[PDB]
Design a protein around this ligand. Structure first.
Ligand SMILES: CN(C)[C@@H]1C(O)=C(C(N)=O)C(=O)[C@@]2(O)C(O)=C3C(=O)c4c(O)cccc4[C@@](C)(O)[C@H]3C[C@@H]12
Ligand SMILES: CN(C)[C@@H]1C(O)=C(C(N)=O)C(=O)[C@@]2(O)C(O)=C3C(=O)c4c(O)cccc4[C@@](C)(O)[C@H]3C[C@@H]12
Ligand SMILES: [Cl-]
Ligand SMILES: [Cl-]
Ligand SMILES: [Cl-]
Ligand SMILES: [Cl-]
Ligand SMILES: [Cl-]
Ligand SMILES: [Cl-]
Ligand SMILES: [Cl-]
Ligand SMILES: [Cl-]
Ligand SMILES: [Mg+2]
Ligand SMILES: [Mg+2]
Lengths: 195, 195
């Protein structure tokens, strides 16, 4: 079949949904594509390189809210961005694991950059903007990982574990997300006051 | 050598630090212990079972702040608990990954339970206590995973990536942790007011 980048990634994503991250191999990708392994090697040098590309592509394809709208607030931006990031990570099997093992690609540099400039333009120091953005990313990645890796009791925990498996985790995610955002705002507004 | 539970786990933890999670195998554990594989199988049935036990043991050994002190506030408890949980997850290679893939063990049921009762005894509904505790756990797991898996630029990002690799991640972690805790308190205090 065709072995241009876009096609190889299409097939590897399809493969990822079939096998998950641990079970994805270049050998099975060759098989899926109808080719021999040394043919694949010309195109894709190893699993690490494949996963690096999948991490970038998964965001490029599906992470629709990386940039703020004209005039949007920083609260609203972080909210929408977190929800988009969560959604994209959920779309493929082990997507958060794929995301974690990879590097902040040159092809996205300018996206991140803009997000950091945006925070700063709304009153955060670089440091605080970064921390805000990192806390959101880590909270979101954590919540998704636990959702995806989720694949006799005491009473509270019995009702916790029922409550906990009542939807996708969307409720607990969204509730935490507001908590975090309000905590950032309380910090931003305080300036040099003891808070 | 000796193949009682405690010894097998000692050796598997030592092995985990040598190989990481992907590279830990029952075969290499047998090797480390000076035994044949079928001897190991009597004791440990597969990797999944090994990892399940390591996840529990890593907390039991090293997670010193699972229960609140007499009279401690819920803010203080969550803070200390998060820091303890982070510390324990960091102690072994891929510790957060080991933690994620495992299940909330019967041997800890009563620890979690108590934490959930404690939140509730301080004014949270079960739901909110749970969410608070889950957001902390997910934020912490996310931050640790990214620390552990962390193993030409634009300016801000250049200074972000320098700032970001200035310590262990302890600063960004602790700053987010306070944000989250304050966000929980703002929610708890508001009751039925629009907030
Ligand atoms: C908050 N939200 C989840 C952000 C986002 O939506 C991204 C995007 N491409 O649209 C990320 O890459 C984003 O999701 C993301 O993963 C970001 C990063 O990983 C990093 C790392 O590791 C180091 C320095 C800077 C960044 C970053 C500023 O680009 C991060 C931006 C993250
Ligand atoms: C907040 N802090 C990190 C808590 C903790 O310190 C624990 C401990 N053993 O001391 C956990 O097990 C704790 O770290 C932890 O992982 C908890 C859990 O995973 C769960 C899951 O998955 C489902 C229901 C309930 C729990 C829980 C209440 O036991 C969680 C308690 C977590
Ligand atoms: Cl071709
Ligand atoms: Cl292409
Ligand atoms: Cl491979
Ligand atoms: Cl807005
Ligand atoms: Cl023995
Ligand atoms: Cl023993
Ligand atoms: Cl194995
Ligand atoms: Cl206190
Ligand atoms: Mg990232
Ligand atoms: Mg857990």
């Amino acid at each position: 079949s065709r072995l241009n980048r876009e096609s190889v990634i299409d097939a590897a994503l399809e493969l990822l949904n079939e096998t998950g991250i641990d079970g994805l191999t270049t050998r099975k990708l060759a098989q899926k594509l109808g080719i021999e392994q040394p043919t694949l090697y010309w195109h894709v040098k190893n699993k690490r390189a494949l996963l690096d590309a999948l991490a970038v592509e998964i965001l490029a394809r599906h992470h629709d809210y990386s940039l703020p709208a004209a005039g949007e607030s920083w609260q609203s931006f972080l909210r929408n961005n977190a929800m988009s990031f969560r959604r994209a990570l959920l779309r493929y099997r082990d997507g958060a694991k794929v995301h974690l093992g990879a590097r902040p690609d040159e092809k996205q540099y300018d996206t991140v950059e803009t997000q950091l400039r945006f925070m700063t333009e709304n009153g955060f120091s670089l440091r605080d903007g970064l921390y805000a953005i990192s806390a959101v990313s880590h909270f979101t990645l954590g919540a998704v990982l636990e959702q995806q890796e989720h694949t006799n009791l005491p009473p509270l925990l019995r009702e916790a574990l029922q409550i906990m498996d009542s939807d996708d985790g969307e409720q607990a995610f969204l509730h935490g997300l507001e908590s975090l955002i309000r905590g950032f705002e309380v910090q931003l507004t305080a300036l040099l006051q003891i808070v």
